[PDB]
Ligand binder design. Structure first.
Ligand SMILES: Nc1ncnc2c1ncn2[C@@H]1O[C@H](CSCC[C@H](N)C(=O)O)[C@@H](O)[C@H]1O
Lengths: 265, 265
C-alpha cells in the first residue's frame, strides 16, 4: 500500500542515504528511472548489488505515460520503491507523480538525497544568492533557444548567481561539457549583444559533485573555455557580484585568479 | 592528515549518505555542530551509536573562533571528520573553514547530504523558479531586521518563489516557527506598506522535511498564521506566479484552497 520515492544522490551508489538504502531493501519491488539524469560514477549493476534487489528500469514514456499502470498497481499490495538520481521531487515532472499515487489510493513518501541545487555550496558561493535556475540546451536544426541567457542577465542584474544545468541526452548518455556551454553562450551573446556573457565574464565550473575529488574551477571565460574539467557531469555557474569571502574561496580553493578580488567584488 | 566535512541530513541520523557513514566510521576523531540547524528526529546518542565513534560537539564560538585550534591540529596527524545538519556548505559560513584548513596545510573533503534547499521540491513548487533566498531573523532589542521583506518583493516582481530560512538560537533552544515568521512579516508590511505580505498572501509551510511525514501546507496567511504545523524546524515559502501544475499539487497534496487552481495568467 506504500510507494517510496527514493533519491540516489549525486554521483555513485554510495550517494543514497542510509534511510533510502534500508527502505529500498525492505521493498518488494524496486523501479528506477534514468532519463531525468544519470549517475556518472556508478552503474545499474552496482546499484543493484548494493540494494540487493533487481531493479526494473523505466523509460520517460514508461513514467510520464504509464506510471499508474506499471508502478502503482503493485503498490496497492506491496511496498514499492521508485529510485531517481539526485533528490526526488527536484526534476520538474516528478511532483505530480504523487498526485497520481493519491488518485490511485496509494500512499507515497519521499526519501531525500543530495542534489546539485544544494551541492553547489561547495563552490564557496552563498546559496542564498542564487537566483532563478536554467538549463543550457543544444541548438537543433532551425531552433536556437536562448532563454537561459536572459535568466543570467536578470539574475546578474540583481547581484544573484545563476546555476546552469547543461544539456543531457540521457538515453544516449551524452553530456554537454562546460566548454560547449561557454561556446554556446558566447554565440548567443554575439546574437543578442546584451553584454551578459563575454570573454571577460567570471564563471565557475563544478564537475562530478558527490565524488570525493570533484573539479572546482573559477576563472574568466577567455581562460577556461578550452580548459579540461574532466569527465561529466559538468555544471556551469555565472556568479553575480561576489562578496569578498566568496572570492577568497574561489581563489584559495577553486584556483581563480587574484584579479577577481578587485574586479568582481 | 585529512578533514572531512560530512552532512548528516534533514531529520535523523539515517539522512546521512552511505558514503558519509562509511568514511565517518573510519575517522580517528569526530567533531560536530548542531547550531546551524535542527535535526528534530534524532539525538547525539543515536548518531554516535550509528557512527560507532564518540562525538565532541562544538559551539558557534568553538567553530567561528577556534576551529583551527580545536579541529585542524588533529587533522594534521589523523583522519578527522566534522559533522553538520543538512549539507555542511549550505546557508552556513562553513565554506570559509576549508580556507582555514588549506592554510593549516590540511586537506579537506566534502560529503554532501540532503538539504532543505533542495527538499523544497516536495512542496510541488518548481525548484528552478526559486529566486534569491533569505532569513527571517528574530528582532533583538531595538534592532528589527527587515531585509528579507525586500527579497520577497524583488522575487515576486519577477514571478519567482522565495525560500525563507527561519531563525534559530540553538543555545537558548529557540526555533522560529512559520507562525512567528508570518507575524514578523505582517509587522514589516505595516511599516513598509508595499503590499508584499498581507492576510491574503498565499504561503507554503514545510515542517520537518526529511521525516516520513513532514507537514506540507499551503494557504492564505489569514488562515495559516495561527495553524499548528507541529514541532520545528519550519521554513516559510512565499510563492510567485504559479504554474497550473504547481497549484494542482498544492491543492492535492498541501490542502491549499481549491480556488488557487484558477490562475490569472
Ligand atoms: N528538515 C527541515 N525542515 C524544515 N526546515 C528546515 C529543515 N532543516 C533545516 N531547515 C530550515 O533551515 C534553517 C537552518 S539553515 C542551515 C541549513 C542546512 N545546511 C541544510 O542544508 O538544510 C532552519 O532554521 C530551518 O528554517
Amino acid at each position: 500500500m506504500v510507494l517510496y520515492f527514493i533519491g540516489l544522490g549525486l554521483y555513485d551508489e554510495r550517494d543514497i542515504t542510509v534511510k533510502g538504502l534500508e527502505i529500498a531493501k525492505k521493498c518488494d519491488y524496486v523501479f528506477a528511472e534514468f532519463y531525468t539524469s544519470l549517475m556518472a560514477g556508478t552503474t545499474l549493476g552496482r546499484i543493484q548489488k548494493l540494494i540487493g534487489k533487481e531493479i526494473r528500469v523505466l523509460s520517460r514514456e514508461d513514467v510520464e505515460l504509464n506510471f499508474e499502470n506499471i508502478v502503482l498497481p503493485l503498490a496497492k499490495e506491496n511496498d514499492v520503491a521508485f529510485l531517481t538520481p539526485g533528490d526526488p521531487m527536484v526534476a520538474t515532472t516528478h511532483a505530480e507523480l504523487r498526485i497520481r499515487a493519491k488518485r490511485a489510493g496509494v500512499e507515497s513518501y519521499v526519501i531525500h538525497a543530495p542534489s546539485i541545487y544544494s551541492a553547489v555550496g561547495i563552490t564557496g558561493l552563498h546559496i542564498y544568492k542564487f537566483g532563478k535556475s536554467a538549463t543550457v540546451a543544444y541548438p537543433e536544426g532551425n531552433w536556437f533557444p536562448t532563454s537561459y541567457y536572459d535568466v543570467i542577465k536578470e539574475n546578474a542584474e540583481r547581484g544573484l548567481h545563476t546555476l546552469l544545468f547543461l544539456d543531457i541526452k540521457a538515453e544516449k548518455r551524452m553530456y554537454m561539457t562546460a566548454n560547449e556551454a561557454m561556446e554556446l553562450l558566447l554565440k548567443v551573446e554575439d546574437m543578442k549583444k546584451g553584454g551578459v556573457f563575454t570573454d571577460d565574464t567570471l564563471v565557475v565550473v563544478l564537475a562530478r559533485a558527490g565524488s570525493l575529488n570533484p573539479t572546482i574551477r573559477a576563472g574568466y571565460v577567455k581562460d577556461l573555455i578550452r580548459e579540461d574539467f574532466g569527465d561529466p557531469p559538468h555544471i556551469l555557474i555565472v556568479p553575480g557580484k561576489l562578496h569578498i569571502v566568496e572570492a577568497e574561496y574561489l581563489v584559495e580553493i577553486a584556483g581563480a585568479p587574484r584579479e577577481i578580488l578587485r574586479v568582481n567584488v
